[PDB]
Amino acid sequence: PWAMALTPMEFARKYNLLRKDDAPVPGEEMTAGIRRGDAKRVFTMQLGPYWDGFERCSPQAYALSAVFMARMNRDRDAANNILKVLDKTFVDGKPDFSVARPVMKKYQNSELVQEVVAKHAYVLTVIASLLEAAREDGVVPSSEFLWLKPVDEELWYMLNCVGRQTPYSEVAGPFAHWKAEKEMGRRSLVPMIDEAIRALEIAVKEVRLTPRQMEELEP
Amino acid sequence: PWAMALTPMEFARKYNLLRKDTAGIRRGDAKRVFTMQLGPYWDGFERCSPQAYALSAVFMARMNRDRDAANNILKVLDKTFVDGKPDFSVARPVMKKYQNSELVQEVVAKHAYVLTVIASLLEAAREDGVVPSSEFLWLKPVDEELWYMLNCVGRQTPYSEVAGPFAHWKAEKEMGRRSLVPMIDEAIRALEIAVKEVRLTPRQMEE
C-alpha cells in the first residue's frame, strides 16, 4: 500500500547491479561487487533532463520552482497562494499547475534566481538549489506538497534530500551531481556521479551473502 | 592564396542547398548545416580548444580592467607564432584568476555554447574600449569559424560561415536566457532572402 524507499541492497538488485568477483580483499569475504558501467547508466538516468527554460519543465517542477522563487524574493503570499490552489484542486482531481504562471513570469529573471540557474545544468539540480535558497526565508517543508509523492517520485525524493547528508538511492545520482556542481563552482553538463557509485559500492560491501546468494551472482 | 569569405550563393552551392523554388533553399539540410556551425556546448573553459581558452582569457582580463594581462597573452601568442606553434598555456594564470569573476559569471550564465559565450565575452571586453581582430591574425589560418565569429560581433550581419551561431547568439539575448535547443531559423530566413535577390542563370540543373 505505502511506497517504501529502497535500501542500497534492494536498489542494487532491482537494477541488476550486483556482480561476482575476479582478479581477495581482507574483511570482505562473502560479499558482492558492483557493475560500474551499469551503475553509471542508472545514476545518469536519475539525473533527468537538462535545464533549458522553465517552460520546458514538467508542470510539477514548474509550479514548485515558482513557489521557491516566490520565497527567495520574500513573497510568502504568492508562494502560499500557489500551494493552497494546488491543494484545493487536488481534493477533487488534477492539481491546477497553471496558477504558477504569474509568479514564474514575475520572478524567473530576478537576481537571486539567475544566480541559482547559472550554477546548475539539470532540472533537478536547479530546483534543489531553488529550495535551499527558499529556506533562507523560512521553513518550506515537504509536507506542503504531499501530493507530489504519488505524482513524481524522483522530484519528491530530490526535494526531500535538500539539507540532508545522505540521499535516497532513488536520487543518489542527482544528489551527487548537485554537490559536484557546488564543489566545482560551476554548472556541469557532463554527469558527476562517481560519489553515488562509491557510496553504493561501500554499502554493498557491508552485507554478507550466503553460499546460495553468491551462486546467484553472475560475472 | 587567400581565404575569401563565401558569398551567400557560394555558401549555398558548397553545401548543396539550392533547389527549384528564384532558386529555393533546402530547409531541412540548411537547418543541419547551421546547427553544425553552432559547435559544442560550453561546459567549463578547460574543455575549449587552446585558442578559445587563450582568447577567452584575454577578453576576461579586459572585462576586469586588466589590460596588461590581456596584452601579455597576445604578445606571447604573437612571438611564439613567428617560430611555429603558439604556447596557449600563457593564459592559464589569467583564466584561473578571472573565470569566476562576477562579470564573467554574468556572461557565462546567458549562453549555452562555446561560440555564444566567447562572442558575449568579446562584447563585454569592448566596454573597456577597442578589442580589434588585428591583435589575433594568427587565428584566421588556425580556426576560421572562431575567426569569423569574433569578426561578426558588433555587426549587423554575419558571414554565412557562422550564421548559425550568430543567429543563436542573438536568439539567446532576445529570450533572455541560455538555450541548449538551437535557434537558427533566422540564419535560414536570411539565406532564403539573399538567394532570392540574385537572379537565376536560365538553363540550370536543379532538383
Numbering used by the authors:
A (entry chain A): 158 to 180, 185 to 380
B (entry chain B): 158 to 178, 192 to 377
Manuscript text:
The T4BS secretion coupling complex of L. pneumophila comprises the inner membrane AAA+ ATPase DotL (IcmO) and two inner membrane/cytoplasmic components, DotM (IcmP) and DotN (IcmJ). Our results suggest that DotM’s cytoplasmic domain is capable of binding directly another subgroup of Legionella effectors that contain acidic Glu-rich motifs at their C terminus.
Further binding studies were conducted with several DotM mutants, where Arg residues (single or double) on the protein’s surface were mutated to Glu. Five mutants were produced: R196E/R197E (termed “M1”), R314E/R315E (termed “M2”), R347E/R348E (termed “M3”), R217E (termed “M4”), and R262E (termed “M5”). M3 and M5 were unaffected suggesting that they are not involved in Glu-rich sequence binding. The final model suggests that CegC3 is primarily helical. Two were successfully obtained (M1 and M4) but attempts at introducing M2 failed for reasons that remain unclear but could be due to a destablization of the DotMLN coupling complex resulting in activation of processes that are stressful to the cell. Intriguingly, among the residues we show here to be involved in this recognition process, only R314 is highly conserved, whereas residues R196, R197, and R217, despite their importance in Glu-rich peptide binding, exhibit a lower conservation.
